[PDB]
Amino acid sequence: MVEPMDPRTFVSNFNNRPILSGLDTVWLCCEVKTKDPSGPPLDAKIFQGKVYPKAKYHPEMRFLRWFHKWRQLHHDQEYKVTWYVSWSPCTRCANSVATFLAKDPKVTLTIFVARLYYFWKPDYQQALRILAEAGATMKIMNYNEFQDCWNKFVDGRGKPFKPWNNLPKHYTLLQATLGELLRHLMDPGTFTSNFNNKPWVSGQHETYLCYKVERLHNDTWVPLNQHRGFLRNQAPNIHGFPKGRHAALCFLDLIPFWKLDGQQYRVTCFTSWSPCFSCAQEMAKFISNNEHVSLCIFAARIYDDQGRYQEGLRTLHRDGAKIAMMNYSEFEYCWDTFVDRQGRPFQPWDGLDEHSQALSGRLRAILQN
Amino acid sequence: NMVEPMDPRTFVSNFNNRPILSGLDTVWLCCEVKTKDPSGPPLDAKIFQGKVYPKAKYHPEMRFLRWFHKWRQLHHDQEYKVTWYVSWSPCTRCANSVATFLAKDPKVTLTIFVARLYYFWKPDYQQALRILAEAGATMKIMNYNEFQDCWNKFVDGRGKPFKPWNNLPKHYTLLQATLGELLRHLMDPGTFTSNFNNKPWVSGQHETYLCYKVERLHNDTWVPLNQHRGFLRNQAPNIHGFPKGRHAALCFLDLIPFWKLDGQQYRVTCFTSWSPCFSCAQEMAKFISNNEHVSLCIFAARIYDDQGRYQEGLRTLHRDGAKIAMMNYSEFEYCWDTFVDRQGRPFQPWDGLDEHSQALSGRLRAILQN
RNA sequence: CCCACGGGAAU
RNA sequence: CCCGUGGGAAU
Ligand SMILES: [Zn+2]
Ligand SMILES: [Zn+2]
Ligand SMILES: [Zn+2]
Ligand SMILES: [Zn+2]
Numbered sequence: 001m002v003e004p005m006d007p008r009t010f011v012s013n014f015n016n017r018p019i020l021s022g023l024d025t026v027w028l029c030c031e032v033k034t035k036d037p038s039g040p041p042l043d044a045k046i047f048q049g050k051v052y053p054k055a056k057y058h059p060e061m062r063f064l065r066w067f068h069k070w071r072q073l074h075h076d077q078e079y080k081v082t083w084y085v086s087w088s089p090c091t092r093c094a095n096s097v098a099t100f101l102a103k104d105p106k107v108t109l110t111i112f113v114a115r116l117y118y119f120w121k122p123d124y125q126q127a128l129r130i131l132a133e134a135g136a137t138m139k140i141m142n143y144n145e146f147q148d149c150w151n152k153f154v155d156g157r158g159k160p161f162k163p164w165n166n167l168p169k170h171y172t173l174l175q176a177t178l179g180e181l182l183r184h185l186m187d188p189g190t191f192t193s194n195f196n197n198k199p200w201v202s203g204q205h206e207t208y209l210c211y212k213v214e215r216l217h218n219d220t221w222v223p224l225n226q227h228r229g230f231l232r233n234q235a236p237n238i239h240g241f242p243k244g245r246h247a248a249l250c251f252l253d254l255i256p257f258w259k260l261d262g263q264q265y266r267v268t269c270f271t272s273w274s275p276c277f278s279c280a281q282e283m284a285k286f287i288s289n290n291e292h293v294s295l296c297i298f299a300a301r302i303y304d305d306q307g308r309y310q311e312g313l314r315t316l317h318r319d320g321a322k323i324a325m326m327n328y329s330e331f332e333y334c335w336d337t338f339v340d341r342q343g344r345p346f347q348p349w350d351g352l353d354e355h356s357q358a359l360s361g362r363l364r365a366i367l368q369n
Numbered sequence: 370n371m372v373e374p375m376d377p378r379t380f381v382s383n384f385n386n387r388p389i390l391s392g393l394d395t396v397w398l399c400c401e402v403k404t405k406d407p408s409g410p411p412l413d414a415k416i417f418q419g420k421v422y423p424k425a426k427y428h429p430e431m432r433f434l435r436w437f438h439k440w441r442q443l444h445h446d447q448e449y450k451v452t453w454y455v456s457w458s459p460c461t462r463c464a465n466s467v468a469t470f471l472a473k474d475p476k477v478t479l480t481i482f483v484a485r486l487y488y489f490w491k492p493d494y495q496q497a498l499r500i501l502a503e504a505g506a507t508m509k510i511m512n513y514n515e516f517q518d519c520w521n522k523f524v525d526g527r528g529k530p531f532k533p534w535n536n537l538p539k540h541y542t543l544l545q546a547t548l549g550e551l552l553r554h555l556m557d558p559g560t561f562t563s564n565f566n567n568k569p570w571v572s573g574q575h576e577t578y579l580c581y582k583v584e585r586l587h588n589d590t591w592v593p594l595n596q597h598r599g600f601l602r603n604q605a606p607n608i609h610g611f612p613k614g615r616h617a618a619l620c621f622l623d624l625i626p627f628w629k630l631d632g633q634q635y636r637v638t639c640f641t642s643w644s645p646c647f648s649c650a651q652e653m654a655k656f657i658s659n660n661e662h663v664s665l666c667i668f669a670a671r672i673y674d675d676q677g678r679y680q681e682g683l684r685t686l687h688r689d690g691a692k693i694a695m696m697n698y699s700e701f702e703y704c705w706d707t708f709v710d711r712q713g714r715p716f717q718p719w720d721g722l723d724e725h726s727q728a729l730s731g732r733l734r735a736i737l738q739n
Numbered sequence: 740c741c742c743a744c745g746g747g748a749a750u
Numbered sequence: 751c752c753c754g755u756g757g758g759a760a761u
Binding site: 387388389390391392393394420421422487488489490491535629 | 754755757758759760761
């Protein structure tokens, strides 16, 4: 029940390169469903509009007009709406959609965007935050979403979705950027489970890495209040990174995307695991070629990778990176800054300062040998 | 005018002069007919197209022949000069059919500019070019002036001027040298004497002529690679070619990778009228550096004082494995017999040959042992 | 045209 | 869609 879009149209418009000129149109594919996700789609429509402001002709506004009509022809139940948009919404449309969502708790909306539109201009940032604040889930389109869009909205003729190169690289950059803009906070239980520095008797291997950037201004380190969030490692996926991507590598990918100048910058990261050998070798390689950027790496635990991890940590120290185990100081900072604590002060786990001292000694042992 | 012009997208993709270029299964042939008078107007102009495959019923050369036979009988009998721009060089069958045509018609002379050489490594298409040149056809590679002239007379340009693609002169260099090899171009005897006389250069003219040959190692024999030997000169600076010029030693280095030599030991010999400058010798050193299966013999008629670091370059070149020697009567007779259009005449040495040869040989040692 | 890479701070 | 490269040994 969709007049599908040309496959040539989809490939050029849903290309998720974060910086991409020449696309003057916003494409919005949408579905309507019931409370039950398993059920079939009630309706589906495609909307297009030009980017520059005669803003009531953006596809977000056209959906609102169509949806009001469509609602008055259907019975009142709970509806789940999904958008695939080539560009994130403008400041005006975000308000108008936020307006809509408040007057209608029967409707919940999830927005998958391919690219972030003007993610560096603070107008469009508030547009996204206002939209999430009004209840809308806001995610970046990934392979599964691009393929699902190709299936339902594109005149593919049975031809399969074929991803472009650098699709996961772009998803990485855009997801972290959205996390920064929306100020995604870590779940408080998640932080405690992964940053407790007692010996790891558990089976879950995942790495969470918090990051912040400061600039040297006069003799003070001034926070770049725009570049701080957290990220975790990418599970292996044939439709993404086939061998996974460790959190240290995704963090290295972000730094060039920030477009930092030649000034003095200090990038601080708090990782639940010390890097393995290959990740530490890439980080050392980085500060090697960027001596205007210093790098402070605090780790909650030392990752024994059953390999050359001790050599990687030494390589990291010899090349200018600060390497230290997190003490109570850092654990409280991460709690207060990156966790969805909601007032609660930092509640230390048992043996924090003791495990912290023990790891600090073991880390020195690695570096002085 | 009286041409149904071709789409500019067609011209840009089809007349691209990259020597190795797949995906172009069509031969485009733009041709003009003119009179004895060069100033005179074009009588008629036509575009012909045909498929590349040897089985295609009418290659564009054959379609021209049929069209010209009709067109001739509608015009009075005079002398005609025909010009072709062809995206691909001709096959052997069309070459014979055109060669047959020109012999039975001395009133017609034909010049063929090709954009790319088709199968220049297979002796069929090589023989095709020699068949055609021998029957009187001028055979040249298209350069900037021709690509532009083709764009003006045959292309639906919409007033927009011809805009050359990148590496047009890089490609032209390779294709021009290849054609000279295939057609067995020989040097003009006056040019050879003027540039290789080893007396002190009292003239103002600085240009470099460089002869080249390849030898192959078989057991302990240097067996001539009788397929890659010719001559070339340095490219003067031109905004529509190499804007900063191209020294002849560099054009010689460009050829060697294009030859696609095997892993065997190969010795590429060159006889240059001038010793390399410092930067050219430094590039030659870089080459023998990165190719230790290829050795390099450089014989020079005269030592080039470049008002710079040339003596260091000559020292670096001899150290890194390249042989450097001055041409003696030995070498001068070889180059005359091999690369010059002598037509029987034996080598007549200029005055003071061996003396200038010995005098420069001493000056070269002085460079090498200091 | 086929393949790979880089770039687009984006009416 | 635009720009800059590299590769086409050539149905
Ligand atoms: Zn808008
Ligand atoms: Zn790692
Ligand atoms: Zn033919
Ligand atoms: Zn030179």
